[PDB]
C-alpha cells in the first residue's frame, strides 16, 4: 500500500475489455463481409439466370 500497484491490474482489465470490444466489432465485420459475398454472388447469379 506504500504505492497502490493494483491500479495497473484494473487498467489491464480495461485494456482486455477494449481489446475484446474491438474483436467483437471484427466478428461483426466478417459477418457483414459474408453478407456482401451473399449479395454480390446473388447479383452474379441473377446475371447468369438472365443468360440461362
Amino acid at each position: 500500500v506504500s504505492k497502490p500497484d493494483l491500479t495497473a491490474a484494473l487498467r489491464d482489465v480495461r485494456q482486455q475489455y477494449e481489446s475484446v470490444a474491438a474483436k467483437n466489432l471484427q466478428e461483426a465485420e466478417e459477418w457483414y463481409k459474408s453478407k456482401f459475398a451473399d449479395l454480390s454472388e446473388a447479383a452474379n447469379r441473377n446475371n447468369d439466370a438472365l443468360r440461362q
Partner: protein, 52 residues
Amino acid sequence: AKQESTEYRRQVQSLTCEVDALKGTNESLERQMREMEENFAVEAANYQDTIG
C-alpha cells in the same frame, strides 16, 4: 409448255419451302444469340465468384 409449267412450279414450290425453312432457322439464330447471353451468364457467374 405444260411439262415446262410443271417443272418451274415444282422448282418454285421447292424454293418456297427453302424460304420458310430458312426463316425457321433465322428464328434459330435468334436462339444462338441467347446461347451467347448464357455464355455471358457464365462470364458473369465466374465474375460473381471473382467479385465475391
